[PDB]
Structure formats: C-alpha cells, structure tokens
Design an enzyme around this catalytic site. Structure first.
Site, mmCIF file in Angstrom:
data_model
loop_
_atom_site.group_PDB
_atom_site.id
_atom_site.type_symbol
_atom_site.label_atom_id
_atom_site.label_comp_id
_atom_site.label_asym_id
_atom_site.label_seq_id
_atom_site.Cartn_x
_atom_site.Cartn_y
_atom_site.Cartn_z
ATOM 1 N N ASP A 148 -10.685 2.906 4.696
ATOM 2 C CA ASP A 148 -11.033 1.471 4.579
ATOM 3 C C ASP A 148 -12.585 1.334 4.417
ATOM 4 O OD1 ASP A 148 -9.264 -0.499 3.878
ATOM 5 O OD2 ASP A 148 -8.445 -0.547 5.627
ATOM 6 N N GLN B 206 -4.132 -1.478 9.776
ATOM 7 C CA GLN B 206 -3.797 -2.709 9.230
ATOM 8 C C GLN B 206 -4.206 -3.680 10.119
ATOM 9 O OE1 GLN B 206 -2.472 -3.501 6.145
ATOM 10 N NE2 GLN B 206 -3.266 -5.688 6.971
ATOM 11 N N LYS C 275 0.960 -1.293 -0.066
ATOM 12 C CA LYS C 275 0.009 -0.109 0.088
ATOM 13 C C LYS C 275 0.772 1.369 0.034
ATOM 14 C CE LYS C 275 -3.535 -2.865 2.672
ATOM 15 N NZ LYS C 275 -4.527 -2.611 3.347
#
Ligand SMILES: NC(=O)c1ccc[n+]([C@@H]2O[C@H](COP(=O)([O-])OP(=O)(O)OC[C@H]3O[C@@H](n4cnc5c(N)ncnc54)[C@H](OP(=O)(O)O)[C@@H]3O)[C@@H](O)[C@H]2O)c1
Ligand SMILES: NC(=O)c1ccc[n+]([C@@H]2O[C@H](COP(=O)([O-])OP(=O)(O)OC[C@H]3O[C@@H](n4cnc5c(N)ncnc54)[C@H](OP(=O)(O)O)[C@@H]3O)[C@@H](O)[C@H]2O)c1
Lengths: 277, 277
Positions: free
Chosen positions: B117, B94, B50
């Site tokens: 997200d 994460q 990412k």
C-alpha cells in the site's frame, strides 16, 4: 506603497533567542558535525557560516574536511562512526558531493535522528505523512519567516516555483500543514507568469537571477526570494527588484531567506539532540 | 460533444495482461497477506475484492481476519511474524483500524519491501525524493489511467482536490514526476470552484457525493473522480454527472478509478516480491 523588506535577520534573531533560552534549561550542549569534501568556494563559505553560528550559540561544532577524491566507502564509514558516536547530535553533509559519490546513498546513511538537513527518506516520509521529524532547513525558514511577519497562511493561494528536494517539495509539504492552497511550478510549467500572477504568497527557488518580473506578480503579493545567484561579485535573488513596486512585501537578497536557513539548522540541531536524549 | 467515459476496467486489463505475462517468466508466485480487524461492511467488501482478484491472477492470497478488539500489541506481533516469513511478499492492513489501535504505528511496522500500500514513511520519502519504492495504489492507478487514455501530463495544469495520505498527496508527488503543474486543494481552499476551473486535468478525492458541479469545470477538462459515496444503495462519485456536459472525458463511478486501484495493488504485490528476490 512600496514593498516592506522582510529581513531574515530580525526573524532569525527570534529563533536564536528561543534557542539560547532553551539551552539554559538543559544539562548538555548540542554537538554538530559538518562534513565537506573538496574546496568548492561556495561550499567553503556556507560551512564556515554554519560553523560560526553554531559556535556563537555555544554548540560543539566541528567541520571535517576531506580531500575531493575521498572514496564513497570512506565517507559511509565515517558517517557510520558518527551515527554510533553518542556525543554527536547532528550530522550534516555539505552538497554538492563530487561526482564519484552517490549522493542519495550518502544521505540515506545518516541516522534519521541526526539528520539535521532532513533529507533522509524517513524524515521526508514523516513530513508528507503528517508525523514528527527533522525537516529541511530552508522550507522551515520560509514558513517561519512568513509567520514571523504576520502572514496567516490558512486559505492563502501559495505558488512555489521550483521543485527541488532541498526547497520546493518540502516547502509545499510544510505549507499544506498551514492549510495553504499550494501550486508547485517548475521549468515545464507553461505560461509561468500567468501561474505566478495568482499567488498571494509567491516563493521562488529556481536559481535564475532576477528572472521574476513585476508583470508576473499579483498586486499586494508577499514575495519570498530563495535564489542566491553569484553575479558580478554581488548576490542576486531570483526576483527582480522592480517587484517591490507591486508586492506588499519582498524578501531582500542577501539577508532574507539565507539567515533563516541558518537559524533553522541550529534549531534542527537542538531538536535532533532532544529526540535522542 | 459529450464526455468520453474513461473506463477503469479497460485500463486495468492492460495492467493484468502485463502481470500475467511477467509471471510465466518467473519461477515463483507472489504471496499477499491482507489483515482485517472487525466486520466493517465496506471493509469486508474491499478485502474480498482484493483477495478475489489476487487469486484470479494466480497469487497466493490469504485474508487474516481478527476480532475487532484485537490488542495493538498482537497486531504488531503478527506483522513482525509476517515480515520475517520469507514466503510472504506483500502485507496489507485494511483501514480503518479500530480506535484503540495507533494506525501510524501499525503501518510503520510493516517492512517497506512488503508495504504494497506504500504508506511506510520510507516509501513516502522515496516517492517525494525521486527514488524507487512501493507507492500508494490509487494514485498509481490515476496516473496509469490517464496515460492509458493518451493524456500527455507534461506541462498540464492539474488540480487535485483532497490532500489525504491515501490519495491526494502521493498523487501530487506522482504527477510532478510526469512534469505536471500541480495544485493541491482541500477543505480550506477559498473559492474552490475558481481553483478547479483552471484545471485541464481535475482529480477529485473528497468523499462528498456529486459535490463538483459543471460550473466548477473547465471546458474540455479531463475529470478523474476518486470518490466512492454509498448513497441510497448506489455508488456516487464526488463529481456530479452533469460534468459530462463540459468535460472532454470523465471517470464513471463505479468502474473508473476503483478498478485501477485494485490493479495497481496486484502490480505492487509483484514488485514487492521481485524487490526482495
Ligand atoms: N538561501 C538558501 O539557504 C538556499 C538554499 C538552497 C538553495 N538556494 C538557491 O536556490 C536556487 C535553486 O537551487 P535548488 O537546489 O533549490 O533547486 P534546483 O534543483 O537546482 O532547481 C530549481 C528548480 O527551479 C526550476 N527552474 C529553473 N529554471 C527555471 C525557469 N527558467 N523557469 C521555471 N522554472 C525553472 C527547475 O524546475 P525543473 O525541475 O522542472 O527543471 C528546478 O527544479 C539556487 O540558486 C541556490 O543558490 C538557496
Ligand atoms: N476508489 C478508490 O480506490 C478509493 C480509495 C480511497 C478512497 N476513496 C474515496 O475517496 C474519498 C476520500 O477519502 P480519502 O481517504 O481519500 O480522503 P479523506 O482524508 O477522508 O478526506 C478527503 C479530503 O477532501 C477534502 N474535502 C472534504 N470535503 C471538502 C469540501 N466540501 N470542499 C473542499 N475539500 C473537501 C478534505 O480536505 P482537508 O484535509 O483540508 O479537510 C480532506 O482532506 C472517500 O469517500 C473514499 O471512499 C476511494
């Protein structure tokens, strides 16, 4: 052979008994505010029934009727006033709102802890994420009704026809929490009858009187009819009564889902109260 | 006869081209913060990818690595600091988080306008209610991939296997917006192969290597394989490669969904930036 009639009144009474029991174990009483703009006759009748039942339970229940041409800025001010009013547990806005008013904007103004109808995106998001919240009343009532009558939803093939924010989508989310396999169908599904024929539990919320015929229904299916279609002074479901020939059990209209929708609104009003206090 | 391979890199490149074009028409550059606790090797590799892609696009991208035993109170403080930092557009945590940390509590701490997200219940609630928001990256990538390769999802029978908050459920919500008929299946579905055999589009996100066999798949189906199963130093999808014998098109692993997940995170980072500014 013929389908049992899944009465909502019998299932609603078990909810009301649960509510009355819990109130005695409480100092306070829950307080519900219902807001209505204008004089839509279906809207008048709905709120009158929500108010009547809340009062019958012993709630503080109050309907605030405003003119149809109330500006949306005044509605939002009133809701903010009710959000801060520490004596109001549940806030409910009767839909549909008049066209000059942005419905999403009004619903998102209600504080999520008082959002007894469960439309605030935080309650929607809690529902689909698996957390705790206040969820929409008809879906809650459909799930509770099925469990009341002994349906074990784990592993069941459920088809939900209709994908509104008021019924189909929160219903699909609640059924997944019961470990059902869920199909969401809608007006762009092709060969809808073939899709519905798979359902062991079929829930119909489309608003087309007697649309669903017996050829659409699997033998021995449990059929839940959410439709309420005012036709010739009668109330017609979305499911044709011939479906009683094939279904193991069928929700009558009126007296099926409708009573459960009211009961779970009363239950959400209690819940909203206890979530604050 | 054999299935086309739906490469994610080709579809991801169209997203990246769109992003580069829009940046020139912008004064600023988007800024992404990625938080990782501990040293899980799969977690290390994901964030490194990412970060590498965000930097390749020209983003300000920064990975904040903390010890595994960071207290959840410190994590929440850091997120609050980043929420107020007007130079940070996107905040990403994460997963998985270590067990001493309440994941829902951390995700709900991220400001919804920086929630690249899409896990914040306000973004979940906007997704299922039909409004605007930041939605989860793998589902966005699956929808975009199918539309890139010319699938008209309106009226299609889609089966989604797996019902997580990261893939299956936001996927089901996004597919409904494309007017698909959606079936959500999962580990308690009975006769899963019969359910999947109906799908014209089959999306599998279960994390079982090569679980789905060709008998499970409808002739000419479009099969999207979200699984990423580390097995014998290889990466195995959830779909057995024999499915290329029956499917019209099949997502490879690696290089299918995975590239699209990264691309739509970069796209959500831009979007979060413009939603503030
Ligand atoms: N008993 C209760 O407590 C209660 C509560 C709420 C509503 N209702 C009743 O439920 C009915 C539906 O209202 P709602 O607000 O839930 O839903 P809605 O948003 O008004 O529409 C229902 C859905 O059904 C689908 N549909 C309509 N006609 C169809 C057809 N011919 N074939 C296949 N699908 C079709 C549509 O799918 P698309 O979106 O793809 O077009 C639509 O989204 C109303 O008549 C209302 O009276 C009853
Ligand atoms: N490529 C990407 O960008 C990406 C992103 C995220 C995840 N993934 C991969 O996707 C996989 C799934 O992870 P996730 O977090 O999305 O999901 P998850 O929550 O870990 O579980 C996946 C779901 O699949 C269902 N399932 C598992 N085994 C099954 C079986 N044998 N038969 C039928 N259903 C079964 C389960 O249903 P129940 O809930 O009913 O038990 C479960 O909810 C992982 O391996 C992960 O590596 C890839």
């Amino acid at each position: 052979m013929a389908a049992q009639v899944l009465s909502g009144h019998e299932a609603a009474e078990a909810v009301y008994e649960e509510i009355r029991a819990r109130l005695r174990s409480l100092s306070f009483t829950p307080s519900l505010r219902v807001i209505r703009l204008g004089e839509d006759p279906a809207s008048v009748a709905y709120v009158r029934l929500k108010d009547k039942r809340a009062r019958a339970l012993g709630y503080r229940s109050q309907v605030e009727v405003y003119p149809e041409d109330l500006p949306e800025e005044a509605l939002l001010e009133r809701i903010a006033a009710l959000n801060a009013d520490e004596e109001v547990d549940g806030i409910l806005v009767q839909l549909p709102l008049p066209p000059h008013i942005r419905t999403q904007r009004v619903l998102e103004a209600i504080h999520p802890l008082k959002d007894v109808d469960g439309f605030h995106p935080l309650n929607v998001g809690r529902l689909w994420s698996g957390g705790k919240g206040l969820f929409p009343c008809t879906p809650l009532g459909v799930v509770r009704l099925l469990k009341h009558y002994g349906v074990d939803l784990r592993g069941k093939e459920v088809v939900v026809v209709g994908r509104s924010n008021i019924v189909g989508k929160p219903l699909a989310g609640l059924l997944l929490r019961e470990d059902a396999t869920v199909t969401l169908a809608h007006s762009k599904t092709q060969d809808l009858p073939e899709v519905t024929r798979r359902a062991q539990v079929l829930v119909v919320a489309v608003g087309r009187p007697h649309l669903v015929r017996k050829e659409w229904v699997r033998e021995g299916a449990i059929v839940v009819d959410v439709g309420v279609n005012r036709v010739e002074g009668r109330l017609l479901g979305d499911v044709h009564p011939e479906v009683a020939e094939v279904a193991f059990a069928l929700t009558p209209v009126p007296g099926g889902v409708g009573p459960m929708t009211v009961a779970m609104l009363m239950g959400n009003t209690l819940e909203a109260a206890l979530l604050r206090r």
